[PDB]
Amino acid sequence: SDLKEVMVLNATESFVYEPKEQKKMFHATVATENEVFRVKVFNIDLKEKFTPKKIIAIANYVCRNGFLEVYPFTLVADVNADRNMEIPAGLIASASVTPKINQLCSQTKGSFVNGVFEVHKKNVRGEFTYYEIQDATGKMEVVVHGRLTTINCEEGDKLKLTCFELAPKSGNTGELRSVIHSHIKVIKT
């Protein structure tokens, strides 16, 4: 847990990811001069520190699944305004790019995905809701369960997804599935 000096790019709002114990978190994206990291923050008192454009130092975090996980024992500190970090606009842009569906569904290995996807169809089956999403490269499905089945998302809207798991399937059939830390923001069109 090498210390990283980073600027905050974006953050979601705090939300309950675990309704039985009411466990809360938010997601953030941060960048060093040369690199982007996706952060899961389990101490929500840190929301202020994670304000976009702010410079912070992060140490004693946990690396899991390609995310930096921030707990109460994790150091998160303001770096002085004497810092003035140089953050390339291109790198900042690399953080906001949405993956192509044709690469996603034909993906042969599991990973965790962020992106903004337009909903072509919505099919609710029992405890699972299936969104068919489309881009210029093709279409695939996003499968939601649990708390996320209550979102209001209709055909024509867009799903801004955070930490969805790509489950590779046989036929170029891979799908995005919601997991414990998943977050959705619906963009109404």
UniProtKB/Swiss-Prot annotation:
Changing residue 53 to A: Impairs DNA binding. The modification N6-acetyllysine is found at residues 24, 40. Expressed in peripheral blood leukocytes, fibroblasts and lymphoid cells. Present in myeloid precursors (CD34+) and throughout monocyte development, but its expression is down-regulated in erythroid and polymorphonuclear precursor cells. Present in prostate, ovary and breast (at protein level). There is a cross-link at residue 109 (Glycyl lysine isopeptide (Lys-Gly) (interchain with G-Cter in SUMO2)). Residues 1-189 are annotated as: Interaction with TP53 core domain. Residues 1-187 form the HIN-200 domain. Induction: Strongly induced by IFNG/IFN-gamma and, to a lesser extent, by alpha interferon. In HL-60 cells, maximum induction by IFNG/IFN-gamma occurs within 12 hours whereas, for IFN-alpha, only 10-fold induction was observed after 36 hours. Induced in vitro by dimethylsulfoxide, retinoic acid and 1,25 dihydroxyvitamin D3. Induced in monocytes by IFN-alpha and viral dsDNA. Induced by glucose restriction. Changing residue 96 to A: Impairs DNA binding. Changing residue 160 to A: Impairs DNA binding. The modification Phosphoserine is found at residue 1. It is found in: Nucleus; Cytoplasm. Ubiquitinated by human herpes simplex virus 1 (HHV-1) ICP0 protein; leading to degradation by the proteasome. Lysine acetylation in the multipartite nuclear localization signal (NLS) regulates the subcellular location. In vitro can be acetylated by p300/EP300 coupled to cytoplasmic localization. It comes from the Eukaryota. Forms homooligomers; isoform 2 can self-associate or associate with isoform 1 or isoform 3. Interacts with TMEM173, AIM2, PYCARD and CASP1. Interacts with BRCA1, TP53, E2F1, RB1 and SP1. Interacts with MTA1. Interacts with PYDC5. Binds double-stranded DNA. Binds preferentially to supercoiled DNA and cruciform DNA structures. Seems to be involved in transcriptional regulation. May function as a transcriptional repressor. Could have a role in the regulation of hematopoietic differentiation through activation of unknown target genes. Controls cellular proliferation by modulating the functions of cell cycle regulatory factors including p53/TP53 and the retinoblastoma protein. Belongs to the HIN-200 family. The HIN-200 domains mediates dsDNA binding via electrostatic interactions. This is Gamma-interferon-inducible protein 16. It comes from Homo sapiens (Human). The lineage of its organism: Eukaryota, Metazoa, Chordata, Craniata, Vertebrata. The chain holds residues 575 to 763 of 785 of the full protein.
